[PDB]
Amino acid sequence: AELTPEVLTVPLNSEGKTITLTEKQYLEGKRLFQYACASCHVGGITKTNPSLDLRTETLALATPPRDNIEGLVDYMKNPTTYDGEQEIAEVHPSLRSADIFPKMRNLTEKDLVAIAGHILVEPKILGDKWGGGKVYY
Amino acid sequence: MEVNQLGFIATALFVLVPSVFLIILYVQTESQQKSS
Amino acid sequence: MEVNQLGFIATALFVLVPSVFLIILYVQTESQQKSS
Amino acid sequence: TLTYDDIVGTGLANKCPTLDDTARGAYPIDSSQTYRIARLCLQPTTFLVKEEPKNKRQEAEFVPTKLVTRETTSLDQIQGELKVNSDGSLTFVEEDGIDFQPVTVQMAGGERIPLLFTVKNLVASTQPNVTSITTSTDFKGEFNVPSYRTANFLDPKGRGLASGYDSAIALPQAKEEELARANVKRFSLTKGQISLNVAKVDGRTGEIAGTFESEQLSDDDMGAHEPHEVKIQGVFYASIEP
Amino acid sequence: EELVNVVDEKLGTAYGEKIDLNNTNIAAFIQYRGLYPTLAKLIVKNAPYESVEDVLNIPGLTERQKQILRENLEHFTVTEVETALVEGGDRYNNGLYK
Amino acid sequence: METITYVFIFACIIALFFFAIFFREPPRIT
Amino acid sequence: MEPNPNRQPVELNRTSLYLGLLLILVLALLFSSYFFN
Amino acid sequence: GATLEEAWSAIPEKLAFYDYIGNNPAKGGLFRTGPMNKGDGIAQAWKGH
Ligand code: CLA
Ligand code: CLA
Ligand SMILES: CCCCCCCCCCCCCCCC(=O)O[C@H](COC(=O)CCCCCCCCCCCC)CO[C@@H]1O[C@@H](CO)[C@H](O)[C@H](O)[C@@H]1O
Ligand code: HEM
Ligand SMILES: CC1=C(/C=C/C(C)=C/C=C\C(C)=C\C=C/C=C(C)/C=C/C=C(C)/C=C/C2=C(C)CCCC2(C)C)C(C)(C)CCC1
Ligand SMILES: CC1=C(/C=C/C(C)=C/C=C\C(C)=C\C=C/C=C(C)/C=C/C=C(C)/C=C/C2=C(C)CCCC2(C)C)C(C)(C)CCC1
Ligand SMILES: CC1=C(/C=C/C(C)=C/C=C\C(C)=C\C=C/C=C(C)/C=C/C=C(C)/C=C/C2=C(C)CCCC2(C)C)C(C)(C)CCC1
């Protein structure tokens, strides 16, 4: 009714294709996002390094584009700075590096796609409350 | 310290005026026996 | 009028402090009969 | 040979390295060798505040002051290439290191004068025709002294420089001007000028120690008061390597 | 004889409109395709530039990096280094977090 | 000045403690 | 805690008080001026 | 053998001061309520003879 189909529909590829979505996947998104750890990352900011946020625009300006339901996947699989210059894999949860961050082991392409869709979706509803912290709270 | 001017006559008189009342009423009574 | 600052606490207390004494000593005595 | 768990508590880490009396043996400088300094340390002891002389014009004074903040004073871990320019004199250009310890000494009266003991952006040089560092050698050069406080900083009542309430605030219809001193917070930048004479040198180690005297300014306090002059004394160690 | 706030004034130069190579916080560097991460560490490090272009002639810049800068050159500007803005290594961490 | 006013009160009160404890009207068991 | 004999009462009559007051109220009236400088 | 200038610039602060009627105890007033300072003010320095 409010969490509508297309409002739950988001960009897939840097090429335009949209994957829409389900109430099921979205949920795993929430369950995940938090379990995958919001511990630094809670709400829509980034406690280890507050300079970078998860707001839609920020992910677009990233390199490579990281607003794609795809993008975030590469990342979670293998991480890269906002340079896309050096792999940040050792300091960031990543399937490339499971042996460091356990929570990242039980993760799957199914589980990923979800935690992903969660990121591109949350802004659509929460508005700015997504990027900002304290201030907007 | 830039403070109010009546600080003294205010605070002070506030003490000595009512106080003096009680003072009076006591020694006025403790003198019933002519003692005091 | 630029005058001294203690004018009030000076002149004033000068009145009320000794005066209060006499006041006391009177009603302390006029109360020997318990009257007052 | 001493561990942190061995030296912590002594209030020793604030006093830095000595050189035993086997010194006076000059260090063999090349002119064919690059040379750099390893942890140059300035441990201090004597803080003198030039007394804001009264209106009368007869020799302004340099009173002695009492230290307040216990041991948070010394500075070291300073490093920088030690240049060997023509006429065989050495110039040491500091690149970084812990060098801005903020201290607050209590003046003759009750004054709390705070300065930022520092030897930053330091460029010290010595006498010419020197192929060896010894009790003879000495170092003189300039500084760079910002201000006690950074750019941000809110004085009680909210005012500030690169932030902060911006005005009288608490007083709304108050008389704007005359508070300029307080509101607009200017930020100082001034020269220091130390002087380093060696007293104990080891020939092989590259180690060298001695007394130093820095003459700098105090706390600008954004604009508050005109700073007070300060002279600083104490011994200093400073190991040299190639 | 009229003292005045420095940051407030320099906010009146081109510093307030674009990104100041010599002063501006390193944080305003993310707002453009692939600049933040490294290029910035070099942009910010590396002496203060008298000309907006001397950026392009920075020791060791990469054949690609070189490009980027060129590309983004649009948004960079300069003004005297500001003692109050650069001291305290604030440029690396201005005290401004989300 | 005003800080003496503070200290004067503060004090005459400590002495209202004197009298009220040591020259206080005693409890008469009758 | 044995009563001291010398406990004579004190005296200031309905009149003496009028004078005592007339005495002060006056100087007060006189010096006030000089107490203002 | 000194400039009339070196001469007086020779005389010591405190001493000139003593030669200032403003310290001569008599000059006061029975009701002149306070410390010599809210009088001529706070002596900051000697101007010169
Ligand atoms: C201003 C309005 C007002 C009016 C019309 C009255 C009228 C009265 N008061 Mg009274 N009184 C007042 C204000 C007033 N009072 C205030 C502000 C106080 C604070 C102390 C008192 C305290 C007081 C006491 C303890 C007693 C009265 C008594 C009385 C009655 C007897 C007449 C008298 O002399 O009073 C007495 C007081 C005054 C006439 C003036 C008091 C002004 C204060 C107390 C100055 C400092 C104390 C001083 C008066 C000593 C009073 C001790 C005692 C004799 C009252 C009379 C009905 C009774 C009485 O007079 O006979 C037993 C009585 O016992 N009053
Ligand atoms: C500061 C030095 C000083 C000392 C060592 C004494 C010592 C004494 N006074 Mg005393 N007195 C003083 C100053 C002093 N007085 C001043 C400045 C006054 C102006 C009023 C008085 C007025 C006074 C009276 C009327 C009487 C004494 C009495 C006495 C003797 C009994 C103890 C007593 O309670 O006094 C009484 C007074 C005080 C203890 C404090 C008085 C301070 C003034 C009066 C405040 C305003 C009035 C208040 C005290 C009411 C007092 C009424 C009366 C009970 C005294 C004792 C030897 C006699 C006594 O106490 O027993 C009969 C006595 O009758 N005094
Ligand atoms: C010229 C115009 C100017 C206008 C005003 C002029 C009026 C002057 C009148 C004065 C007459 C001469 C001397 C009067 C003396 C007198 O009066 O003496 C006693 C009065 O009490 C008194 O007043 C006793 C004085 C107590 C004053 C209390 C304030 C001073 C100390 C307060 C300290 C507080 C920290 C009364 O008499 C005394 O007491 C009597 C008993 O009632 C005895 O019989 C004796 O006569 C004994 O001498
Ligand atoms: C588990 C779910 C997480 C997801 C989906 C996620 C996602 C991301 C993304 C997309 C970025 C890059 C943002 C951009 O440049 O646009 C990033 C950066 C970063 N993340 Fe996470 N993150 C997660 C968990 C964590 C955790 C648990 C930490 C704690 C260490 C962390 C620390 C960081 C840091 C420090 C950066 C900045 C990288 C740098 O520039 O050095 N992340 N994250
Ligand atoms: C000072 C001050 C002030 C105020 C004031 C006042 C106001 C005071 C007072 C007070 C007063 C002014 C009070 C009053 C009153 C009163 C009275 C005093 C009363 C009464 C009465 C009596 C006492 C008596 C009476 C009678 C008799 C005698 C008997 C019977 C009959 C008849 C009733 C008539 C100010 C603000 C500036 C501030 C500072 C301080
Ligand atoms: C204020 C003023 C002033 C001055 C002042 C004064 C100084 C006051 C006061 C006063 C006083 C300060 C007085 C005093 C005193 C006293 C007394 C008060 C006394 C005593 C005592 C008593 C009361 C008691 C005692 C006792 C008892 C209790 C019993 C027995 C034992 C004995 C002896 C211990 C001036 C200049 C600023 C000016 C303005 C005003
Ligand atoms: C500025 C002036 C002044 C003033 C003064 C005054 C204001 C005073 C006073 C007064 C006072 C200041 C008072 C007081 C007091 C008293 C006392 C202080 C007492 C006491 C008490 C006690 C000590 C107690 C004890 C006890 C008790 C009671 C019980 C419990 C606890 C005990 C046991 C401990 C003078 C003169 C300095 C100088 C000139 C001017």
Q: The CATH number of the domain where A14 resides is what? A: 1.10.760.10
Which residues of A does the annotation place in the binding site for heme c? 37, 40-41, 92
Virtual torsion, Cα D12, D16, D20, D26, nearest 10 deg: 180
> Would you say the C-alpha torsion A73, A79, A80, A81 has a positive or negative sign?
positive
Give the span between the Cα atoms of C19 and A59, in whole angstroms. 86
* Element of type H or E holding D110: none
Are E55 and E21 in contact by the 8 Å Cβ rule? The answer is yes
Domain of E78 in residue numbering reads as 1-87
| Number of domains making up chain E | 1
Three-class SS state of D189: coil
Is it the case that chain E and chain B have 3 or more CB pairs lying under 8 Å apart? no
Q: Where are the beta strands (DSSP E) in chain E?
A: 19-20, 76-77
Residue H18 has phi, psi (to 5 degrees) of: -60, -30
| Eight-state DSSP code of residue E39 | I
Residue E95 within any structural domain of the chain: no
Non-local CB neighbours of A16 within 8 Å, separated by 6+ positions: none
Q: Is the C-beta atom of F11 inside 6 A of ligand 7?
A: yes
Are A110 and A22 in contact by the 8 Å Cβ rule? The answer is no
Give the span between the Cα atoms of D95 and D80, in whole angstroms. 5
Residue D62 has phi, psi (to 5 degrees) of: -125, 75
Three-class SS state of A54: coil
- CA C29 vs CA B18, C7, E73, G25: distances in Å: 21, 33, 100, 22
For atom 2 of ligand 6, which residue has the closest CA?
A: C10
Q: Smallest Cα–Cα separation from D42: which of D242, D233, D240?
A: D233
Residue B29 has phi, psi (to 5 degrees) of: -90, -40
| Eight-state DSSP code of residue E1 | -
Task: For residue A117, count other CB atoms closer than 10 A to its CB.
Answer: 25
Q: The CATH number of the domain where E37 resides is what? A: 1.10.150.320
* Single-letter amino acid code for the residue at A74: D
Residue E28 within any structural domain of the chain: yes
CA H16 to chain centre: 6
Nearest-CA residue of chain H relative to D54? H44
Give the span between the Cα atoms of A65 and A84, in whole angstroms. 10
Structure tokens at H27: 């000059």
- The answer to whether the bond into A64 is cis (omega within 30° of 0) is yes
CA of residue F7 to ligand 6 center, whole Å: 14
Q: Which residues of H19-44 are buried (b: 16+ CB within 10 A; e: fewer)?
A: eeeeeeeeeeeeeeeeeeeeeeeeee
Give the span between the Cα atoms of D77 and D236, in whole angstroms. 12
Residue E21 within any structural domain of the chain: yes
Residue E66 within any structural domain of the chain: yes
Virtual torsion, Cα B22, G23, F5, G34, nearest 10 deg: 160
D54 in contact with chain H, both atoms CB, cutoff 8 A: yes
For atom 28 of ligand 7, which residue has the closest CA?
A: F18
Q: At which residue do the structure tokens 């699989």 appear?
A: A77
Are D216 and D145 in contact by the 8 Å Cβ rule? The answer is yes
Chain breaks in chain B following residues, C–N > 2.5 Å? none
Set of chain H residues whose Cβ sits within 8 Å of the Cβ of D56: 13, 45-46
DSSP string, F10-30: HHHHHHHHHHHHHSSPP----
- Beta strand pairing status for D75-85 and D27-28? unpaired
Give the span between the Cα atoms of F12 and B4, in whole angstroms. 23
Structure tokens at D219: 């706390």
CA of residue C6 to ligand 5 center, whole Å: 22
- Beta strand pairing status for D138-142 and D112-118? unpaired
Give the span between the Cα atoms of B14 and B19, in whole angstroms. 8
Give the span between the Cα atoms of D235 and D40, in whole angstroms. 11
> Would you say the C-alpha torsion G8, G9, G15, G17 has a positive or negative sign?
positive
Task: For residue E29, count other CB atoms closer than 10 A to its CB.
Answer: 20
Report the residue of B6, B15, B29 to disrupt the F interface, i.e. the one with the largest count of F CBs within 10 Å: B15
| Eight-state DSSP code of residue D167 | S
Resolution attained, angstroms: 4.0
Q: Is the C-beta atom of A72 inside 6 A of ligand 4?
A: yes
Domain of A98 in residue numbering reads as 1-137
Structure tokens at A92: 């960031």
Task: For residue D52, count other CB atoms closer than 10 A to its CB.
Answer: 15
Give the span between the Cα atoms of D120 and D102, in whole angstroms. 13
| Eight-state DSSP code of residue C18 | H
Give the span between the Cα atoms of D83 and D94, in whole angstroms. 11
Q: Which of B13, B15, B16, B17 to mutate to test the pocket of ligand 5 (most atoms within 8 A of CB)?
A: B13
> Would you say the C-alpha torsion D36, D42, D43, D45 has a positive or negative sign?
positive
For atom 38 of ligand 6, which residue has the closest CA?
A: C10
Give the span between the Cα atoms of D196 and D173, in whole angstroms. 55
Chain breaks in chain A following residues, C–N > 2.5 Å? none
Is it the case that chain D and chain G have 3 or more CB pairs lying under 8 Å apart? no
Q: At which residue do the structure tokens 């404890």 appear?
A: F21
For atom 16 of ligand 2, which residue has the closest CA?
A: C21
| Number of domains making up chain A | 1
CA of residue D119 to ligand 6 center, whole Å: 59
Give the span between the Cα atoms of A74 and A80, in whole angstroms. 9
Question: Which residues partner with D212 through β-bridges?
Answer: D196, D234
Domains and CATH numbers, chain D: 21-149+186-242 (2.40.160.30), 150-185 (3.30.2050.10)
- The answer to whether the bond into D146 is cis (omega within 30° of 0) is no
CA E20 to chain centre: 4
Residue E73 within any structural domain of the chain: yes
Are A59 and A76 in contact by the 8 Å Cβ rule? The answer is no
Residue E93 within any structural domain of the chain: no
Q: Report how many helices (DSSP H) and strands (DSSP E) chain G contains, helices first.
A: 1, 0
